[PDB]
Ligand binder design. Structure first.
Ligand code: ICS
Ligand code: CLF
Ligand SMILES: [Ca+2]
Ligand SMILES: [Ca+2]
Lengths: 477, 522, 522
């Protein structure tokens, strides 16, 4: 389709909206022009959501507790407030870890204060202290406590910073109050910012005056990789076959000690720019640690990122990088040779949170699949600046798409595959259009590195070419 | 490394030697993990009887709850009606979590909208959010009704829903005749089952409060059925099939079975089936109203008795043999229709099934948890089978329900070692199953970790989990099962006896060690 | 020594130290047992490819067969008629074994009588025995019809059932109009399905051969349905339900569902329901005749086409998605009734489940066995689901059936690694699953032993069993399941996906070893 058909489709979709909502939504939709570098000329982003339009965004609590603070395993994460917020986000995210759950690891456990009506009226600052005492009593091997605020906490005026300071002074334990109320932000992105601020202000600077760690010129830290389905692991090995020593992971399969040891490294490899650029910039400003963005989706991007990371170091690291690339070359070549003929020419439409709508494009390109449309839920203008150089000409772009907009776009464009979250999976699976969960990898993976590319290709082939998509139309109709 | 012909996912790829070495290096160098001996000592300490005493003294800490917030049930009740859009007045994360929860449980699309309230709405209220959301929702998705619930933000702020909706209709955002029922569902009062009650009570008020003058009890010769918070489509289908066989004229209020199960035929249907507004308006003209789950439909019972003047019969949930018989007899008494032969034969088949499998169920010890009505029905059915529900738990339970369950237990020899707990979470149940080991567990998917905790101590201490309840995430299409009436009793009996036989087969499969008991006929 | 509070059955009582010592002393003193190292070596040798090569060279020895004798199917076919006592002309041990087999499967009373032929009957014959048996059976267990089958003994002696029954009627032993159909069912030819076919063909002959003059095809506006050898009541119920929903007039010419699921209401019923004699007499007047399992109904098809002049359609067993659609379309074409919207919605709901569960069923290797039609339908459904069969086995299958299955496999990209076997027992399947390991087995309870052997070699080599077929002895009430039509496809899909997920949960339950993939949501 050309730029003329796409704009007509955009206007036809927006015709049903009320005039104010129509004007607001016209700014968030655009047709990609790769020659444009300043996305603000085309797409507005990080704006509020129009009420009643069934958006797909989340809350700051999801961005902070669900995304950033959650994967930390050695800490205990209290969900201060009613039961629902903590209950719905429990173990819904596949941030893998290694530990004995309930003894030294607590990722898939729901700790909450369970506010009743007597706590909304009379406050909950004493309940929090009693809860901290009980947590210390029953879980002695925890290495810290993080109190994530839910919506009522800010509204009723509860002072959790004071409680955190007092109980940290008493128990000599790291207690981090996070003000990640759901109403504070328009989406999960402000949750990322709040969680990074809490990390910076309460955890990161503990070992500023400690020099007992044996630093090496090859120390690196993986930032913004939350180990979905093991993703971070598949990356970490690829960074240790080149001789680099990964000191910390943020935050999938991460521990409170790696976070404190992070300022003792020589380079920060940031995978998710959106959720961790806030702390990467702080570390660069304070400790002088440089940081760079790498992409491990697909063989091409992985090779380019490894070559760049090696170029950040001396000649031995570059030789090891070339050795690793040569070693892994036949493995991904076989996967491409097997699966590309089956997935050649297919058209994909993506809609994911803030990083993957542009990161996984390289993986689909390596299989001969064309992304005819991509968009984000809570990405800023930077993200679209990076995206416009990734998408082809005349491809659709959307921001904070609604159910109606996405459904109409899919019906007209008719993509061969759709990649989005659980809340859209069955909507497009009832339309006879194959769907892949690009958040949790559809309970598969990992997809990072050369080991994850085979799984990626296998999943895409098994979903697009499944024989279940030819049976929707009844033979007697 | 990956092989193009044998590709391994996260399991068992990370069991390779290189990944093991990498993880070991990570743990040794940077994690600063406690020594394995300390971890093993602490884990054994958690399984002792001393740890249970500390655990049950918890007063401010809740670990692994077994309940949700009211607006979840409110959203389900709103989905129960025809062309009804659930609209939650509050922040937008709540709606996303509700939709994710219901999609993961039912594996079907769930449609709900929000006002996307933010920091400006926290300071100046959310009236403009209400107006714009109502207008946008009516214009875009075109519902015949918008059912408004509230999060805990709107309740703490103190947003007056009635005032906001009235000011929205008079301003011209929505037509004055457009039905917009509302309900106040604070997430810090009760649980998800209470939200269903509040939403249904609000809808019934909106549709019947202003027109009770010309309503005569018995005009349409029908019976109203209020299911409650039900997460099994089979229960909705059986509660209608039994009445259809019985010949009774019935009107199922809040029926979401159709929208939560739609065909995959190339088109997406946002709305399907559901109770029509005519049925809600005509509800007061029914002979009587029956509440299938009376322990969370108390406010609805108050509204029906006080306003509709229907004398709601005091019935228990149709789970088991005796309570299903009581339900059928009460329905026959109310409608005057004799019980047909197609249900006596079904009852006889259920009794035959009970008699065939009594030698395996007798003396088995079960620990259960869930919703009050479901838990009490399951306890009654277990007592009817000769099983011992040693541990009974209900996080969202009250003391009257506990007293009723104790009365049920005392009326049977098998309810002798049973202990009912209210306000306790799943960590209390883990402590209970470690010290007083049952033979199985009956609950939702959250009980799997508890089983994993029991296996770590040892194979001889493992407590298998039987998945009956809500939510069930790690199994596919179990939401199509049935738990009400005779068919539900048959399915539950089959599941229990087959789980027992499967565990027995697993324990006796080691050749030349325990396989002497590996009987072909079991 | 058993404590009174905790009584132990054989397991784990025989795991006590004193019992272990007693068994060890018995083994050492007098068993002269081979050394354990030799046993392990022999086992490992049996788990090798060389042992498979030796195994497939078998010509006379059959180990662990997967079929039964004709009279079993004859008895099951006889049980499908109204007040028809299955009477077997032969030894009584047979009848006892048939009754025990059916009681262990269905867990319901089964009525079958024998004339108790003995060594005296070997030389003289079975005429007086036949007369006395007929008279006693009619006097004591009054039926309206008696079906006569034969064991091997009666076949070897070469009895003349027709002549014997005619003489019995002639010599004042039974009324000359009492219905006494008969069929020759040699146990050394074919299998139980062949016996069912012979019995049904004999009954149809007896009831229709001499009255074809006044039979007009289509004069009653009905479609005859011959279910064949079926062991699931759910299939009988679902076929009738679908035909009723379509509005088509049907006559199930074998309905043992009623007698095999009688209620337990304090009285014992020897007969219940079944096909009436009038339906059999009027069968030639039907619009057409549809065979649900066309493979083991060759003789019935020949009789129907030759005598009744009905044009039997070439329809596969209505298992899966495509063949059910073909069956529904053919029935609509024959009867003229349009396909209702309920069946379309059910097909859409099945496709929804297929789309939801497709990510777990894809690339799963299954080894199956059973009856020809059932195995063929299961293979077709597995190919439709994306699963790849590897070892398709059928002990009582013929070469034409193998050609048809190969044609089915070659039409899909998932039958690439599938190998069909005809005439191989479960020892061949044990060797196949040991050398070419599949993910799961799908069959009757006998494969229960195979899963044990594969466990002895190692946990990584275990092949879990899924019990879908006949007979099932170690699971209660699985005979009530459905395998035909859309409902039966939904149940099979649910069973398969839940078995896969249960195995995955078991494999990833080791704490801090493999529990990283112990996802809550799958
Ligand atoms: S953190 Fe972010 S929505 Fe960067 S909130 Fe979201 S595990 Fe997405 S596109 Mo779920 S900015 Fe991570 C994300 Fe991307 S939870 Fe995961 S998949 S790379
Ligand atoms: S934005 Fe929570 S789900 Fe809600 S009604 Fe309250 S208990 Fe229930 Fe974010 S912090 Fe949480 S998830 Fe929402 S409430 Fe706010
Ligand atoms: Ca679905
Ligand atoms: Ca029985």
């Amino acid at each position: 389709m050309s730029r003329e058909e796409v704009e007509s489709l955009i206007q036809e979709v927006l015709e049903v909206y009320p005039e104010k909502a129509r004007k607001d939504r016209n700014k968030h939709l655009a047709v990609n022009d790769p020659a444009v570098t300043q996305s603000k000329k085309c797409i507005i982003s990080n704006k509020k959501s129009q009420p009643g339009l069934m958006t797909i965004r989340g809350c700051a609590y999801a961005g902070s507790k669900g995304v950033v603070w959650g994967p930390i395993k050695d800490m205990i994460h209290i969900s201060h407030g009613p039961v629902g917020c903590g209950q719905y986000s429990r173990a819904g995210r596949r941030n893998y870890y290694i530990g004995t759950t309930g003894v030294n690891a607590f990722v898939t456990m729901n700790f909450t204060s369970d506010f009743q009506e007597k706590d909304i009226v009379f406050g909950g600052d004493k309940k929090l202290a009693k809860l901290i005492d009980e947590v210390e009593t029953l879980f002695p091997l925890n290495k810290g406590i993080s109190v994530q605020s839910e919506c009522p906490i800010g509204l009723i005026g509860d002072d959790i910073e004071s409680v955190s300071k007092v109980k940290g002074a008493e128990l000599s334990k790291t207690i981090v109050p996070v003000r990640c109320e759901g109403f504070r932000g328009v989406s999960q992105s402000l949750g990322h910012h709040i969680a990074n601020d809490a990390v910076r202000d309460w955890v990161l600077g503990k070992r500023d005056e400690d020099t007992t760690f044996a630093s090496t010129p090859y120390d690196v830290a993986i930032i913004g990789d939350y180990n979905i389905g093991g993703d971070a692991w598949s990356s970490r090995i690829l960074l240790e076959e080149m001789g680099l020593r990964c000191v910390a992971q943020w935050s999938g399969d991460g521990s409170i000690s790696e976070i404190e040891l992070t300022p003792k490294v020589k380079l920060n490899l940031v995978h998710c720019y959106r959720s961790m650029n806030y702390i990467s910039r702080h570390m660069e400003e304070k400790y002088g640690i440089p940081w760079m963005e790498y992409n491990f989706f697909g063989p091409t991007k992985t090779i380019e990122s490894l070559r760049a990371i090696a170029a950040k170091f001396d000649e031995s690291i570059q030789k090891k990088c070339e050795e690793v690339i040569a070693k892994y070359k036949p493995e991904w070549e076989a996967v491409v040779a097997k699966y590309r003929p089956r997935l050649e020419g297919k058209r994909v439409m993506l809609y994911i949170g803030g990083l993957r709508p542009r990161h996984v494009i390289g993986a689909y390109e390596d299989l001969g699949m064309e992304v005819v449309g991509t968009g984000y839920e809570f990405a800023h203008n930077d993200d679209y600046d990076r995206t416009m150089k990734e998408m082809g000409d005349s491809t659709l772009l959307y921001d904070d798409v609604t159910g109606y907009e996405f459904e109409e776009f899919v019906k007209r464009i008719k993509p061969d595959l759709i990649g989005s979250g659980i809340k859209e999976k069955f909507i497009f699976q009832k339309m006879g259009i194959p769907f892949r969960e690009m958040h949790s990898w559809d309970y598969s993976g990992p997809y990072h590195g050369f080991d994850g590319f085979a799984i990626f290709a296998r999943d895409m082939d098994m979903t697009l070419n499944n024989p279940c998509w030819k049976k929707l139309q009844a033979p007697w109709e | 490394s990956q092989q193009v012909d044998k590709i391994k996912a996260s399991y068992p790829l990370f069991l390779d030697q290189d990944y093991k070495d990498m993880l070991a290096k990570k743990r040794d160098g940077f994690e600063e993990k406690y020594p394995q001996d300390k971890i093993d000592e602490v884990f054994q300490w958690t399984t002792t009887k001393e740890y249970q005493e500390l655990n049950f003294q918890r007063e401010a800490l809740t670990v692994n709850p077994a309940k949700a917030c009211q607006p979840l049930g409110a959203v389900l009740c709103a989905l129960g009606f025809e062309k009804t859009m659930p609209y939650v007045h509050g922040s937008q994360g709540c709606v996303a979590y509700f939709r994710s929860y219901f999609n993961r449980h039912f594996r079907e699309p769930v449609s709900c909208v929000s006002d996307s309230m933010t920091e400006d709405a926290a300071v100046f209220g959310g009236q403009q959010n209400m107006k714009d959301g109502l207008q946008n929702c009516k214009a875009t998705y075109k519902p015949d009704m918008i059912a408004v619930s509230t999060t805990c933000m709107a309740e703490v702020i103190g947003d007056d829903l009635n005032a906001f909706i009235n000011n929205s209709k008079k301003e011209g955002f929505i037509p004055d005749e457009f039905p917009v029922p509302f309900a106040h569902t604070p997430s810090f009062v009760g649980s998800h089952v209470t939200g269903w009650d509040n939403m249904f009570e609000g809808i019934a008020r909106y549709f019947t409060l202003k027109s009770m003058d010309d309503k005569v009890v018995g005009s349409n010769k029908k019976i109203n059925i209020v299911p409650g918070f039900e997460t099994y489509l089979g229960n909705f289908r059986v509660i209608k099939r039994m009445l259809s066989e019985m010949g009774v004229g019935y009107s199922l209020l809040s029926d979401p079975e159709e929208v939560l199960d739609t065909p995959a035929d190339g088109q997406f249907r946002m709305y399907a089936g559901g109770t029509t507004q005519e049925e809600m308006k005509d509800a007061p003209n029914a002979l009587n109203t029956v509440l299938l789950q009376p322990w969370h439909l108390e406010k609805t019972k108050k509204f029906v008795e006080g306003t509709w003047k229907h004398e709601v019969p005091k019935l228990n949930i149709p789970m088991g043999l005796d309570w299903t018989d009581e339900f059928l007899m009460k329905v026959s008494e109310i409608s005057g229709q004799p019980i047909p032969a197609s249900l006596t034969k079904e009852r006889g088949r259920l009794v035959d099934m009970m008699t065939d499998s009594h030698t395996w169920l007798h003396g088995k010890r079960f620990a259960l948890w869930g919703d009050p009505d479901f838990v009490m029905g399951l306890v009654k059915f277990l007592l009817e089978l000769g099983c011992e529900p040693v541990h009974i738990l209900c996080h969202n339970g009250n003391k009257r329900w506990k007293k009723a369950v104790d009365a049920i237990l005392a009326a049977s020899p098998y309810g002798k070692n049973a202990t009912v707990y209210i306000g306790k979470d799943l960590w209390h149940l883990r402590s209970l199953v470690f010290t007083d080991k049952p033979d199985f567990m009956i609950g939702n998917s959250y009980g799997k970790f508890i089983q994993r905790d029991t296996l770590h101590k040892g194979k001889e201490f493992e407590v298998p989990l039987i998945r009956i309840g809500f939510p069930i995430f790690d199994r596919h299409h179990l939401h199509r099962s049935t738990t009400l009436g005779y068919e539900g009793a048959m399915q539950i009996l089959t599941t229990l006896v087959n789980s027992i036989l499967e565990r027995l087969d697993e324990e006796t499969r080691g050749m030349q060690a325990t396989d002497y008991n590996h009987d072909l006929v079991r």
